[PDB]
Design a protein around this ligand. Structure first.
Ligand SMILES: N=C(N)NCCC[C@H](N)C(=O)NO
Ligand SMILES: [Zn+2]
Length: 411
């Protein structure tokens, strides 16, 4: 039961799990109503016009496969439906063993307290918090790990982003930082079945639709990487050979790793070792920082308590003197779990749903959906409902057969 509370958009703010909040480095935004669906995880049912200065408008630019609709997610009812859709996908992910593990890792992934210039001092990094406005009018500073928010101008441009320090590279120095995922449970993508000799022949008809749960899990995987500060520099790319009429299409290692499967293998053995040793070295530095820490600022919690929070996050070893160190095999398990076990491909397998076999299998269309009604989608079966006749040959995902759950929009 990942979300132990039925949240309706119109429920009165209480200053605890329903409240108007302000986001860091968002300049001077108006407070937005948010919901805390799980410890360290909030959801803002608004179009994202706060995380980025240059993207504070929902206006359709000169363009470039995208989808725009400045009116999407503008009504309370829509926001209410958005909230229920996100909450439902989390329950779907969490219902699996893989998902239960991923979300647990995310919740234990508190961004490191490395905001002090004094090495004998542990301090929080302000951009890893939000201000929770209370019913009285005061604001309470709250640390959080994950924020799910609506998309910006391009509705289908989902992504996992964060604020990041002035000097430090939080998503790549092992510290981690609060992750903001632009996502929408109201849309999904259509892909075409790459007819391979051993693939099921009884496949209903043309287009199939991506299960929004796989899509959210995809972003959650980026979040895990970023929260543990072991994300692969987005500069790193593989020059994919597509056509002969193409002298090259770049695809980042971070994406190939996240998708997993055959795709992940484009990251050769030399690069894998490089990233692993690098991050191993980074964890060892976090251990040293914790070891030199004698005081904590922004006081409330005890020093030992916070040190312990990071001993748990990084799976550090503590001797009888109380000094932390990094254990090679524990690091290996943690790192492998985050980069090789949590992948889009492994989720497609747990969920038992049809999905593109690789990015190379680019989505043909964009569909409008609504997973909230149980008559349409369930936590356990997604679109391929049991009693129904949709639970056969993935009929539930067939946009021809399950034409009533999909409404074509673009491409
Ligand atoms: N299935 C999709 N078409 N996903 C939409 C987001 C694609 C984006 N590049 C991304 O992967 N972000 O993480
Ligand atoms: Zn991605």
């Amino acid at each position: 039961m990942f979300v132990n509370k039925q949240f309706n958009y119109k429920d009165p703010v209480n200053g605890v799990d329903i409240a108007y909040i302000k986001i860091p480095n968002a300049g001077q935004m108006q407070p937005v109503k948010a919901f805390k669906i799980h410890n360290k995880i909030w959801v803002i049912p608004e179009r994202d016009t706060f995380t980025n200065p240059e993207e504070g408008d929902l206006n359709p630019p000169p363009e470039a496969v995208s989808y725009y609709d400045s009116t999407y997610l503008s009504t309370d009812n829509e926001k209410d439906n958005y909230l229920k859709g996100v909450t439902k996908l989390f329950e779907r992910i969490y219902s699996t063993d893989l998902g239960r593990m991923l979300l647990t890792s995310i919740v234990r992934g508190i961004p490191f307290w490395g905001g002090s210039t004094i090495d004998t001092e542990l301090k929080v990094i302000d951009t890893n918090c939000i201000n929770v406005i209370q019913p009285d009018g005061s604001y309470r500073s709250e640390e959080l790990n994950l924020v799910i928010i609506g998309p910006s101008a391009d509705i289908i441009q989902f992504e996992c982003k964060s604020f990041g320090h002035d000097v430090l590279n939080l998503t790549r120095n092992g510290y981690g930082s609060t992750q903001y995922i632009r996502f929408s449970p109201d849309f999904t993508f259509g892909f075409e079945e790459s007819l391979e000799v051993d693939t099921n022949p009884l496949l209903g008809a043309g287009k199939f639709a991506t299960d929004p749960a796989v899509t959210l899990a995809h972003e959650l995987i980026h979040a895990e990487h970023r929260l543990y500060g072991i994300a692969i520099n987005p500069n790193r790319v593989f020059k994919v050979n597509t056509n002969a009429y193409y002298e090259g299409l770049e695809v980042s290692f971070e994406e190939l790793r996240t998708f997993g499967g055959h795709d992940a293998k484009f990251i050769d053995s030399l690069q894998e070792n490089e990233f692993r040793l690098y991050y191993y070295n980074k964890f060892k530095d976090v251990a040293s920082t914790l070891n030199k820490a004698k005081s904590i600022i922004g006081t409330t919690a005890s020093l030992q308590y916070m040190k312990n929070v990071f001993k748990e996050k990084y799976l550090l070893s503590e001797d009888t003197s109380g000094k932390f160190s990094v254990d090679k095999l524990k690091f290996d398990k943690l790192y492998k779990m985050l980069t090789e076990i949590y992948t889009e491909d492994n989720f497609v397998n747990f969920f038992k749903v049809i999905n593109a076999k690789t990015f190379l299998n680019f989505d043909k269309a964009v569909f409008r959906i609504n997973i909230v009604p149980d008559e349409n989608y369930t936590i356990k079966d997604g679109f391929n409902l049991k009693g129904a006749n949709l639970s056969t040959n993935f009929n539930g995902q067939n946009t021809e057969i399950n034409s009533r759950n999909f409404t074509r929009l673009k491409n």
